A paper describes a structure:
LASV GP is the sole antigen on the viral surface and is the primary target of the adaptive immune response. Three GP monomers associate on the viral surface to form a trimer that drives viral attachment and cell entry.
Three copies of both 25.10C and 18.5C-M30 Fab fragments bind a single LI GP trimer. The other, 36.1F, is LIV-specific and does not neutralize LI. Indeed, position 95 is the only nonconserved residue at the 36.1F binding site between the two lineages. In contrast, the pan-LASV 25.10C has a shorter CDR H3 that does not contact residue 95 and instead interacts with E75 in GP1. Inclusion of R95 in future vaccine candidates may help elicit antibodies that neutralize in a 25.10C-like manner.
Residue numbers in the entry:
A (entry chain G): 1 to 209
B (entry chain a): 276 to 414
C (entry chain A): 66 to 142, 153 to 167, 182 to 195, 214 to 244
D (entry chain F): 3 to 134, 142 to 222
């Protein structure tokens, strides 16, 4: 029995009510459980039987639904209420994907930088080009790699950090590594960035032997 | 009007009747369903008032049996079962709802025989009779 | 129009015993959410001595009244209780014991065994219902 | 509380046992289950065992490979994993199930046990510099097998602009990250900055100085 969860992510400013939905292929009557997990912590049960509240829970955490549609409502979001949530069928014991929650702020324009491989990486031969991006919001963005006049590498590693407790910001780092023979057979390396928080896409490029 | 919740129904959530229909449960003593209502009310009262039970109350139920349920009807169903006639299982109940208006009827329990819930045709005549009752209830 | 409704008897899990069948040789009665009795048809002997003491069991006072009240009313309508456990067997009188067993569930077998067990989701198709105990009582 | 143990590192094709111990309740009467979480993914049910080990249920994606048992003398729950593959690295939990409203639910969890599968051994870290208004100096660490490798700057003096992206794997079984510090150019025009990298599994300490260009 499929257990589709909506949405992928959502941001809530303090002092608001939010809705998170769980849908299934078949009518499971009322057998659905709502769990909440903190980063690095074991998940804790919030709602059992899709309507009931467990002992030791805030009263705003409400659940409803039947048949194939279920919905969890959080009425008064608080600092300790930013985590990940899971909807689970109890008959077949299957979990979901997850909905993430974070504090909402006005857009902060990202700053983008690029760096070619250093000399030591040329000694080893693993020439690595890195594109770094600071202070972007929201989480969605898009990146691309270009080699020589134009190309699409398509083989790079991407990493994003978590929200900070002081300014509540993100960051992003992309790394592309190539062998010495492949490094020396091209001339120009560039990273392309498009951002929901940016008016125009940006290309950062350089040429090397 | 007495109503049934989602914890005491299977596949249903809120299916409930009018008080005038439930009013027949203390006049006629040939209905198979009112015993279940009496048991549900007793359970609610027991779990509400008498708090912190000490590993079940066997005597309370032993004494409520003599006061709430119809032992003659249970023995009748048992005798009908051991003598191979369609009998009652105390788990399936059918009724009429008259979806145009909303007025309903007190359920009569389903007829089980040979381990198979015999179909609506095999007792359809009874259906018609009860329909005539609502005809007599139309005025 | 005609509609059908089915009742969930597990809301009577406290204040009423519940019973349901698993196979033709196994039956289960349940008190609370942790304890119940197994009624098993078998051709294996568990105890040998031909003496059932029941007054000593109630005089022990280290027991659970709810568990053995059911077996008491079953007896009214050999044993071995050493250590506090519950274990009753009827060896094969046959007509009465089989009739009572069939009354709960509403040959070529030598014994019927009543024993203590912890609750599990045992009975496959037959939903729990209290009508059997109301009949026996 | 529930205490979980047995995790570690095992090569592909091996086998492992996980123990979960219960204290604070009557472990005899309770359904138990094992749940899984992959790195960056959501939860994933693994297995379920009944009170007297009579009914046992398994996930279909891995059927025929894990065995769940319980010894109620020690209140112990063991999971045997056989023929470990590359995607059998995760954090595992043992939860206590409960029967309410004709429905199962798990209202008590443990801490978490880490199981890693990889065909590699501890490799010496490769610490390299990344030199450039404002500038962001990078300290790039490559080809180190166990994840824990501490990064600092001047023994914690650099408390602003420090960003350590999460470690990501490699096709060779090794990891990599790049700790960055952002600052105007006065710091580099007046001082040379030191990135401290410590690889505990390989017992290496490199205090590398950036070379701005
Ligand atoms: C064994 O038998 C018992 C009794 O029949 C069953 O327990 C009952 O289960 C129902 C279904 O959940 C309970 O009804 C709901 O209980 C919720 C929990 O609150 C109660 O918590 C404690 C018990 O820990 C009680 O003592 C206390 O009085 C509370 O009543 C309530 O929250 C529900 O009320 C409302 O909840 C939501 C909140 O958003 C609303 O939206 C709903 O509309 C609803 O009105 C509701 O009361 C009932 O309380 C339970 N009774 C007892 C005595 O525990 C077991 O389920 C059964 N076991 C099995 C396996 O079937
Ligand atoms: C059969 O049913 C009975 C009752 O229906 C049931 O007994 C109850 O079990 C629950 C859960 O084990 C008990 O509730 C707990 O009691 C302890 C007592 O110290 C509290 O510490 C608990 O609070 C902690 O746990 C919560 C949930 O994990 C946390 O949210 C909370 O913050 C605390 O950390 C919790 O209240 C309850 O006391 C008993 N008894 C009764 C009368 O309810 C029994 O377990 C069922 N049997 C089986 C086999 O299922
Ligand atoms: C009904 O279910 C019971 C429970 O599984 C079956 O009893 C099992 O019988 C086999 C022998 O064929 C034993 O090996 C098992 O140990 C028994 N299970 C127990 C005791 O829990 C029984 O065979 C099934 N069928 C009938 C007709 O009773
Ligand atoms: C317990 O005993 C009964 C007999 O009272 C067994 O039933 C017999 O089984 C054999 C099997 O070879 C048949 O040939 C007989 O016809 C059966 N009936 C009788 C009256 O003998 C029963 O099988 C025994 N239990 C088990 C598990 O074998
Ligand atoms: C049925 O009840 C009896 C009586 O308590 C149980 O027998 C003892 O139970 C205690 C509590 O778990 C154990 O410490 C003893 O070891 C049991 N006695 C023996 C001789 O083993 C019996 O275990 C219960 N049945 C089940 C299935 O738990
Ligand atoms: C009869 O039909 C109405 C139509 O909405 C419905 O609300 C009601 O629950 C039905 N009666 C029963 C007893 O289900
Ligand atoms: C019960 O079974 C038979 C009687 O038919 C006999 O062989 C056996 O010894 C009896 N045991 C007890 C304890 O009565
Ligand atoms: C209890 O049963 C045993 C069975 O061997 C018997 O020896 C003993 O006398 C009995 N005790 C009584 C009846 O008080």
């Amino acid at each position: 029995i499929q257990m589709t969860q909506s949405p992928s992510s959502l941001s809530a400013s303090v002092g608001d009510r939010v809705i998170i939905t769980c849908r299934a292929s078949q009518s499971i009557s009322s057998s659905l459980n709502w769990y909440q997990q903190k980063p690095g912590k074991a998940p804790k049960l919030l709602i059992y039987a899709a309507v009931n509240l467990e002992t030791g829970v805030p009263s705003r955490f409400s659940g409803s639904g039947f048949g194939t549609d279920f919905t969890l409502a959080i009425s008064n979001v608080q600092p300790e209420d930013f985590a990940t949530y899971y909807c689970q069928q109890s008959d077949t014991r299957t979990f979901g994907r997850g909905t993430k929650l974070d504090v909402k702020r006005t857009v902060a324009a990202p700053s983008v930088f690029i760096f070619p491989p250093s000399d030591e990486q040329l000694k080893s031969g693993t020439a690595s080009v890195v594109c770094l991006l600071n202070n972007f919001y929201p989480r969605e963005a898009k990146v691309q790699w270009k080699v020589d006049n134009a190309l699409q590498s398509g083989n790079s590693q991407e990493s994003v950090t978590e929200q900070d407790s002081k300014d509540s910001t993100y960051s992003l780092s992309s790394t592309l590594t190539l062998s010495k023979a492949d490094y020396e057979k091209h001339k120009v390396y560039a990273c392309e960035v498009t951002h929901q928080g940016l008016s125009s896409p940006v290309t950062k490029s350089f040429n090397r032997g | 009007g007495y109503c049934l919740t989602r914890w005491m129904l299977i596949e249903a959530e809120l299916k409930c009747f009018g008080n005038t229909a439930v009013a027949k449960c203390n006049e006629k003593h040939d209905e198979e369903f009112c015993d279940m209502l009496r048991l549900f009310d007793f359970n609610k009262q027991a779990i509400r008032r008498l708090k912190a039970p000490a590993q079940m109350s066997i005597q309370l139920i032993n004494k409520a049996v003599n006061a709430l349920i119809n032992d003659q009807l249970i023995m009748k169903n048992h005798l009908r079962d051991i003598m191979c006639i369609p009998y009652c299982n105390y788990s399936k109940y059918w009724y009429l709802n008259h979806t145009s208006s909303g007025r309903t009827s007190l359920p009569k329990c389903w007829l089980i025989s040979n381990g198979s819930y015999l179909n609506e045709t095999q007792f359809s005549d009874d259906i018609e009779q009860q329909a005539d009752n609502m005809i007599t209830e139309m005025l | 129009e005609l509609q059908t409704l089915e009742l969930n008897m597990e809301t009577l899990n406290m204040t009423m015993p519940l019973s349901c069948t698993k196979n033709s040789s196994h039956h289960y009665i349940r008190v609370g959410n942790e304890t119940g009795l197994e009624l098993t048809l078998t051709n294996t002997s568990i105890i040998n001595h031909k003496f059932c003491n029941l007054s000593d069991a109630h005089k022990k006072n280290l027991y659970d009244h709810a568990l053995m009240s059911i077996i008491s009313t079953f007896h009214l309508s050999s044993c071995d209780f050493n250590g506090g456990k519950i274990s009753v067997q009827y060896n094969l009188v046959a007509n009465g014991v089989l009739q009572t067993f069939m009354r709960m569930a509403w040959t070529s077998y030598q014994y019927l065994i009543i024993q203590n067990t912890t609750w599990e989701d045992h009975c496959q198709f037959s939903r729990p219902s209290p009508i059997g105990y109301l009949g026996l009582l | 509380q529930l205490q979980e143990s047995g995790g570690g590192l095992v090569k592909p094709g091996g086998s492992l046992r996980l123990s979960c111990t219960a204290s604070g309740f009557n472990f005899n009467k309770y359904n138990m289950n094992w749940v899984r979480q992959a790195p960056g993914k959501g939860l994933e049910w693994v297995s379920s065992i009944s009170a007297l080990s009579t009914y046992i249920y398994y996930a279909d994606s891995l059927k025929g490979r894990f065995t769940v048992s319980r010894d109620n003398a020690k209140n112990s729950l063991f999971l045997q994993m056989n023929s470990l593959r590359d995607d059998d690295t995760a954090v595992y939990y043992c939860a206590r199930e409960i029967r309410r409203a004709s429905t199962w639910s798990a209202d008590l969890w443990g801490r978490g046990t880490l199981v890693t599968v990889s065909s590699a051994s501890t490799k010496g870290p490769s610490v390299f510099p990344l030199a450039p208004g404002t500038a962001a100096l990078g300290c790039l660490v490559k080809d180190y097998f166990p994840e824990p490798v501490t990064v600092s700057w001047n023994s914690g003096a650099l408390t602003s602009g420090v960003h350590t992206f999460p470690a990501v794997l490699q096709s060779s079984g090794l990891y990599s990250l790049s700790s960055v510090v952002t600052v105007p150019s006065s710091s580099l025009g007046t001082q040379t900055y030191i990135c401290n990298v410590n690889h505990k599994p390989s017992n290496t300490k490199v205090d590398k100085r950036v070379e701005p260009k």
